[PDB]
Nucleic acid binder design. Structure first.
Lengths: 155, 65, 115, 32
RNA sequence: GGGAGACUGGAAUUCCUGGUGUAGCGGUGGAAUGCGCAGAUAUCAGGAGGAACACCGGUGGCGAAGGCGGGUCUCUGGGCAGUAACUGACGCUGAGGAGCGAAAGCGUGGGGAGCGAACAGGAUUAGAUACCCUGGUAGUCCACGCCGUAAACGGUGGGUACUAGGUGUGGGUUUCCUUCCUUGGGAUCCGUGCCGUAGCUAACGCAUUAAGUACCCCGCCUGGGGAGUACGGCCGCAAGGCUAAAACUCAAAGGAAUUGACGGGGGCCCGCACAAGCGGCGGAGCAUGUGGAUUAAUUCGAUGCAACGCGAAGAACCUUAC
């Protein structure tokens, strides 16, 4: 990253649901290098949500990502003997991928014994914004706008 | 560099009686301006400074508002 | 005591930050310093301590029912702006930010240099 | 020039100053 | 802002008195001495006292050099330009000598807010008679006298004439396109800076403000230490200053520039160096190596990075060196 920006690998469109969102989701929930396992897991969660709420899965996943959307990140920069928490605006792609990481981690945090329903439950409650992820995201905006005093460093 | 106002043949006589003329040459905090900002010659600059000090003395201008 | 309008004096140096809410006649209602909040030693110069002291003083003054505040600030820069934000967030209306810091006219003699 | 010569001169001078300091009363008594 | 005397202005610091007002304030890399809870810090109002003059303010002005800027009044020295009316060489330097001469210091009488040698604690350190923190006397100030020293430096004595220019600033007189508004421009006398010819220099650099080309006068130098010391003398209340050697000892002491190396000196540029991310270690058990301890021996080697699942890609005997 010293020379310049590095290229970004293009995303592969999904074969079944036809969205980069679901393949990004399975990639982030991917672990141990076993795409089949996580892939059938995300299929199970998708079909569970579809059969539970009886709605369109793609639109409710976009609704969930919009409800877990961050706005202004906080990053530490070193000056004057201390590290100050400067706020920085976030481009949409990083926000989306980190929010999806958040929702995957929080689905892993659910305690109903199997994630094939944990992730679906997280999807449906994020459609209502009732999970812990959305409240903690609200806390993130709380902190971001609470530390707005360091609006002059602009780091 | 702007020319000196008082170096003209039709300039005004510098005096501490006139407060607006000295109000021109003092800043928003009551301080005296430099002569690079104004461009007036050394002589007229020192007359302006002395006049401002006298005006402060006789209580016509604030001591650093 | 019930007073609608008052003032806030903030003094920030390289060692401490002291906030005091007063009447327009100068009588003090409540004060909170950077070490009264629970910071001891070198830590009471950081902006976090300034914010905590400012909000604590603002809350104590608000308990007496202060609505609008004219803030006078003083001293070098340790927690000036952070204190202003802390008062404005605690529920006080700022009317004017006036910086009255003493400035000698070449009187007295400052101490020597640190080597 | 260099400062080594200056500090040699200062060292000789300071030694003489200390020698003068050490024996003021004796010099006073002996001179009279 | 050249000097002397008198009167006088405001900000700020400290202190005292009286309100509001609570439990901390101060200081530092971090702290502790310290100041408070008997009312501190903070914040209002009043009073006392001393010292220095923010903005104008600069490579700008004045003075023989020291040096000189809050305001006003009184007394006073020097310089520059123009006219050239006046005297008629009355000039230059000047051994001795006299006068002035930063800061510190001494004497007599006041003053004393801030600052601060010496002096006390606190801190760091293997020790800190210091750097850092808290107090603090002389002194800093005034009146009148002494001493007479500095890197008192442009490390460059005074006077005069000559030798390419370019470019700023301070003070004053003149001609011409001229709006005579105007730094319009040119000419001219005295200063004050920058860059550059010839020339000079060991080089660095100086270069019309010469360290260039010449004349007059004064001061000073003759290897480094011993030594600006001893003796004699003059001056001083004292500290001390001024004039100024010898015995002896070394084979050198120095000035300028060059190339490397080094810096608890800077400036740039790279690298999974950080940053953004994923997965671990330090947590338990077990396997290997090492330090440490016993033992008859626990063979030897390897000790930041760059040794520690390393020589050893094979210790029941054999390896094996104990």
């Amino acid at each position: 990253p010293r020379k310049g920006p590095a290229p970004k690998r293009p995303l592969v469109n999904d074969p079944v649901y036809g969205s980069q969102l679901v393949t990004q989701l399975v990639n982030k929930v991917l672990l141990e290098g076993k795409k089949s396992l996580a892939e059938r897991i995300v299929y199970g969660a998708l079909e569970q949500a579809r059969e539970k709420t009886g709605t369109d899965p793609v639109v409710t996943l976009k609704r969930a990502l919009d409800n877990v959307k961050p706005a202004l990140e906080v990053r530490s920069r070193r000056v004057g003997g201390a590290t100050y928490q400067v706020p920085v605006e976030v481009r949409p792609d990083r926000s989306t991928t980190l929010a999806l990481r958040w929702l995957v981690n929080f689905s892993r945090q659910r305690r109903e014994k199997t994630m094939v329903e944990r992730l679906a439950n997280e999807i449906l409650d994020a459609s209502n914004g009732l999970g812990a992820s959305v409240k903690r995201r609200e806390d993130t905006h709380k902190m971001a706008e609470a530390n707005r005093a360091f609006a002059h460093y602009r780091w | 560099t702007r020319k000196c106002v008082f170096c003209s043949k039709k300039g005004q006589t510098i005096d501490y009686k006139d407060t607006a003329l000295l109000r021109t040459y003092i800043s928003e905090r009551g301080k005296i301006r430099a002569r690079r900002v104004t461009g007036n010659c050394v002589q007229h600059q020192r007359d302006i400074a002395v006049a401002v000090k006298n005006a402060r003395e006789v209580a016509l201008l604030p001591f650093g508002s | 005591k019930n007073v609608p309008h008052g003032a806030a004096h903030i003094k920030s140096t390289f060692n401490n930050t002291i906030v005091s809410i007063t009447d327009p006649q100068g009588n003090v209602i409540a004060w909170a310093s950077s070490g009264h909040v629970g910071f001891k030693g070198s830590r009471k110069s950081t902006p976090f301590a300034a914010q905590l002291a400012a909000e604590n003083a603002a809350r104590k003054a608000q308990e007496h029912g202060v609505k609008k505040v004219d803030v006078f600030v003083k001293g070098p820069g340790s927690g000036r702006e952070t204190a202003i934000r802390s008062l404005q967030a605690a529920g006080l209306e700022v009317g004017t930010i006036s910086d009255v810091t003493p400035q000698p006219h070449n009187g007295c003699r400052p101490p020597k240099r640190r080597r | 020039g260099s400062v080594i010569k200056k500090r040699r001169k200062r060292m000789s001078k300071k030694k003489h100053r200390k020698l003068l300091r050490r024996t003021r009363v004796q010099r006073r008594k002996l001179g009279k």
